[PDB]
Design a binder for this molecule. Sequence first.
Ligand SMILES: Nc1nc2c(ncn2[C@@H]2O[C@H](COP(=O)(O)OP(=O)(O)O)[C@@H](O)[C@H]2O)c(=O)[nH]1
Ligand SMILES: [Mg+2]
Lengths: 170, 11
Amino acid sequence: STEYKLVVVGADGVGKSALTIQLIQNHFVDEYDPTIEDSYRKQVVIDGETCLLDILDTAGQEEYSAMRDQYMRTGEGFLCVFAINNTKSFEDIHHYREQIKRVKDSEDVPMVLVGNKCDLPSRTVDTKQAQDLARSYGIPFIETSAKTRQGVDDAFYTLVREIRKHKEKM
Amino acid sequence: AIGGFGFWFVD
Ligand SMILES: Nc1nc2c(ncn2[C@@H]2O[C@H](COP(=O)(O)OP(=O)(O)O)[C@@H](O)[C@H]2O)c(=O)[nH]1
Ligand SMILES: [Mg+2]
């Protein structure tokens, strides 16, 4: 069992809690308290390795949080989530990413850019701008849907893969 | 007070 500390970040309403609960409990939450921050520890198999994912589902954008401070410093991977029907959530990505890098004091922080809510027809963030942004960062870009579970596993498994590549480089 | 915001209060 190999441990992996992940932190799910992104604007309110992007689907962080829904993505996290889809991964851990295999159910879509239509409503979930936007205010609650919580951690989850689940055993999973990724590329033959039995992993233990310790995920922090962040909340409370405007307020202080000691748990999020501890997870931002010690976290190995960060799932940077935006919603494809929300250009402001996409525009906040660089802010979360640069905040993460500064708290980590490193330009080598494993991250995956997630474009959640790909099941919706009303779309505002073109796959091109998000792909170009991920390419500029040198990070993978996965489109997901917590509602249909599309790409949910691929998003967190890819983050674990980025952490392995970083861990073997150092 | 590490930004940008991002999370408020990350110091
Ligand atoms: N259509 C759709 N709605 C979603 C998806 N993921 C989350 N939602 C909904 O969007 C709202 C915000 O989701 P939530 O997980 O609580 O977001 P958080 O604030 O980022 O934790 C909720 O009503 C969710 O049910 C998705 O992929 N598709
Ligand atoms: Mg939430």
